[PDB]
Design a protein around this ligand. Sequence first.
Ligand SMILES: NC(=O)c1ccc[n+]([C@@H]2O[C@H](COP(=O)([O-])OP(=O)(O)OC[C@H]3O[C@@H](n4cnc5c(N)ncnc54)[C@H](O)[C@@H]3O)[C@@H](O)[C@H]2O)c1
Ligand SMILES: NC(=O)c1ccc[n+]([C@@H]2O[C@H](COP(=O)([O-])OP(=O)(O)OC[C@H]3O[C@@H](n4cnc5c(N)ncnc54)[C@H](O)[C@@H]3O)[C@@H](O)[C@H]2O)c1
Ligand SMILES: [Mg+2]
Ligand SMILES: [Mg+2]
Lengths: 585, 531
Amino acid sequence: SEPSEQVLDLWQQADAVCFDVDRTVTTDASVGLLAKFMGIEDEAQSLTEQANRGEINLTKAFEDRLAKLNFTPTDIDRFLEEHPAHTRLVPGVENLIAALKARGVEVFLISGGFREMALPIASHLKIPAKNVFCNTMSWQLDDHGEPVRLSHFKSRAIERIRRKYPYNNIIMVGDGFSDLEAMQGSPDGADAFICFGGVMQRPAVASQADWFVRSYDELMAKLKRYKVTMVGSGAWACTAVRMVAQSTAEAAQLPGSVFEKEVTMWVHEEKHSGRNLIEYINENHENPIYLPGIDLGENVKATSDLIEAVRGADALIFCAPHQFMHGICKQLAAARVVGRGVKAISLTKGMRVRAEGPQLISQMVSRILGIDCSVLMGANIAGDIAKEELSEAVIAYANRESGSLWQQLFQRPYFAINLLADVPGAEMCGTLKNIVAVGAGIGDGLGVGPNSKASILRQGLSEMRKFCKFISPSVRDDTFFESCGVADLIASSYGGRNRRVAEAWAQKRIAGDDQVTFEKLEKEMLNGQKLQGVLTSDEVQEILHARGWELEFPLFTTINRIIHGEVPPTMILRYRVACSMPSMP
Amino acid sequence: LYFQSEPSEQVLDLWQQADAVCFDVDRTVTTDASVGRFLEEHPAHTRLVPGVENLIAALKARGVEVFLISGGFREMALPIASHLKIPAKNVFCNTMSSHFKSRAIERIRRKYPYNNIIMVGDGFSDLEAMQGSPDGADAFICFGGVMQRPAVASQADWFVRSYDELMAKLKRYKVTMVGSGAWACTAVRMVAQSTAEAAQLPGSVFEKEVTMWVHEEKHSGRNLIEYINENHENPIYLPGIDLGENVKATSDLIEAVRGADALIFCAPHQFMHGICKQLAAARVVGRGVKAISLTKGMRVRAEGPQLISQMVSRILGIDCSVLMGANIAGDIAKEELSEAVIAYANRESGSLWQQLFQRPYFAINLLADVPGAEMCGTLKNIVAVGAGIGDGLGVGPNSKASILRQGLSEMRKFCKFISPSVRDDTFFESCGVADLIASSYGGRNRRVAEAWAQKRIAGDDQVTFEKLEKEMLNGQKLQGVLTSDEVQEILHARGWELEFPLFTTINRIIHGEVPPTMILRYRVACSMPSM
Ligand SMILES: NC(=O)c1ccc[n+]([C@@H]2O[C@H](COP(=O)([O-])OP(=O)(O)OC[C@H]3O[C@@H](n4cnc5c(N)ncnc54)[C@H](O)[C@@H]3O)[C@@H](O)[C@H]2O)c1
Ligand SMILES: NC(=O)c1ccc[n+]([C@@H]2O[C@H](COP(=O)([O-])OP(=O)(O)OC[C@H]3O[C@@H](n4cnc5c(N)ncnc54)[C@H](O)[C@@H]3O)[C@@H](O)[C@H]2O)c1
Ligand SMILES: [Mg+2]
Ligand SMILES: [Mg+2]
């Protein structure tokens, strides 16, 4: 009894697990349990072997036991009552099937027996009839349904499943030869056969099995359990880890939890607080600097060592101010601590300029760490979500398997998640919208009214759209209508830090203060938190200058020219003109 | 055998219906002939005949294709054509190393869809542009400024000594505004700015005076009209603001419209049907009239939406454009930079309306998509009401942005269900996203909706939107609640209520069925049991 390298992988990376009914899910075989109650035991048991059903004449047990009858529907009703399909299940199998479904593995029953027997078992395990592959008895039916009785089954059923669903790794779990057949018959069959000899062993079928087990807690305990590490500890990082921590605490209250209960959070050490910050977080479950008054749960564990935070981690969340991200990825690469099977997601907004082009955080993680990286982008001002005000976000998945994991991790009753395939569109919207929020706040600082502010947003959204098409034409218009697009741009233009600081900057510039800078105000206003829109403005302007697109994006350009003092703030609604106008003295 | 003094009425009509006008260069566009590589065209604006620059601009302003047909030298004429914004391809002329003009006009008739073509010139070559072919000019206007040649003048359908005479017979539109509320007045103020500017030149596309129908109310209307005409200001709906000196108010709907070549409809939408029936019955709106609607809101017809532009077309028998954008009236009235879309019935009208509405502080974008821009303008007010409800609950910016995201989403979905022709690009225009944002943070529907929800939650459930409209709005009308009711009738007819859970939640909140606090939980609220 023991597994094997790439088999264990297939079990852990499974997209669907198919269970045989008779003697893998049920303690007793159906045909015989039905023989008793029907008093034909030995007539049956004289059919249930290999001197009869070992070659037979032209029939197997199921097909033949059916032939034996003068038997009526009210009888099948009775029997299912005498043996309620909850008394019939091998211990540990309900817990195993529940665990699989809880992490999005689809579960099938595939049986060579009677449908009328498998469906109550399916109903009990929460498996839909849609997922039960099993022939019915031949019933005469009439004009509603059911007065009186009138090879390669499992490999073929697996072939149909494979053509119907986006599943690539499909496992067969069973005791008989029909189950072994599920893999051996045809190449599009099961990718692995696990033989369950908990009820009946069967040395000949166990021998060609990919894995032989006696208990289901043998399978359960080889289910992957993801350890989660949050890389970052700012305002949004902490309210994020707080939501993520609530999910794992929920998942660990059930047997086959897909997540470790404890979430690790890397906290960058700052000179003015040193080690005391980390210790405060672990003792009081609060980041009192970046998210004061908010209880990160009791299952959040802070550490200041980046390598140690990451080493055990199966699920990495990247959420740090974007100017730091390149250095953070370079450190993790050098340490060789990120296994290539690790799932990553980025919550970060901002980009690096590379080869005269945009590199978003998710592209940075993939290129440098060699792993796939999803994103979570939405209208998400942290402080309010930390207080559990209703909010929403898009998760754009690198591939569909990731999406399911991330959604289970991040979705809370106050934080609704929408899965999208468009990672380049979500991510570029999340990043570019902070430029527009700077423009929006320069507007506010000027005093402009709702009509004019709406113009800045309209033009901003239209240029986000255009830039997305200039750089990744795959991007779908639909994406701008989701939470990562128009929702985020609005919340950030009316309630974000970029708007807030840019308003103050523009008020001061107008009043004569020609020396005030965004860097100074960031220090003065944001209490350690990081301004992202002006950095993003410069990053994009670098790309615009390089590609000669300064006039293709007039609002982006006049916002940068205003930040850097070539155009006066008052020209913000005059972008069509301010983008090309000669600089001021 | 004298010069044709006044043209013959057929000729007059042909002038106004011209698709293209062809000018001779020598002695009709320029005062001189030629004479004198190198290429020292020393001037080219001192060459010009008075009025011709004004005339050619006035023709272009009317969509008339202008050409140069010269028996002289091309390199000599290109500079003229450039100054006059006539592309090189519209200059028919020889280089430097006979039926020439009628031959050139035959080409034009083959390469363009122009059927009415007029020749303007001084010489015999210009006369032959009409006479020398059954496919030549349809009329010949002889220009006797510079050179008076009686042989050419005796022939020719029209003789003039000054281009002023031609410019006076160009089509000229008389504009009346149907409506006199806040937005109609600030609209009228902009329009009158444009006609006053245009009327400073000889061949103005617009008559200077703009007429405004001011509906008479029982409370204050016997001298309203007189106050407006003498003080140039609507003190009830737009106090403090100078409508132009060229705005004339009347309370007679039919006579306001009787003279009018260009109609602007901008009255609260609940009265537009009636207004349309009356003008139809008075038989005062001719099939030639140009119409544009600024009204947001709909009428339910055949349990489908009828938007105001459709109402105008069906009932008055004319095409109707629309102007839609993020246009809170008070700020535009004060000349704060703003933007709008004009979705045009046809490109020709779109051009006319842009000349009328566009101001240095009010930029216009032309768009072919009328059903999209108009349905956005109408649906936006529903979401604004939901936004105001969230505001009255103290909902934060994440949460309000969800209302707007779901709102915009349902706007786009309803648009496509009703009019599959609507292009996605339309929602990114000022009529879509911009207007929904402006009105969700700064509009009347947001404000009243806010006051309403504040009072509800604070325990007053006798308060009504009608009450608040009366108390808060000073005569002005609340379009968001009416439009929510209109859409909801359509939703209930087509079984769409759950297809649009935010719309449904908003309507159920407005009436007593769902508590205001459920606004962020619309997905569940749309179908939850009442109370
Ligand atoms: N705050 C929000 O409401 C919000 C919402 C959505 C997305 N975001 C995005 O999340 C990302 C991070 O935001 P945040 O709110 O978690 O951070 P933050 O703005 O709160 O910044 C504070 C963090 O900066 C860290 N820091 C300071 N110097 C550092 C250094 N040299 N190296 C590494 N870290 C350093 C500090 O450890 C601190 O934790 C940003 O890209 C932001 O655009 C923020
Ligand atoms: N106010 C804005 O900022 C704004 C901006 C853009 C679009 N709009 C839309 O354009 C229209 C604007 O209307 P408004 O702002 O010009 O008007 P308003 O709401 O300011 O005033 C109400 C008007 O209703 C008139 N009226 C006509 N027939 C009437 C009748 N039988 N009974 C009572 N009153 C009658 C009254 O004379 C009065 O002038 C609306 O459809 C609106 O949705 C308004
Ligand atoms: Mg079996
Ligand atoms: Mg001549």
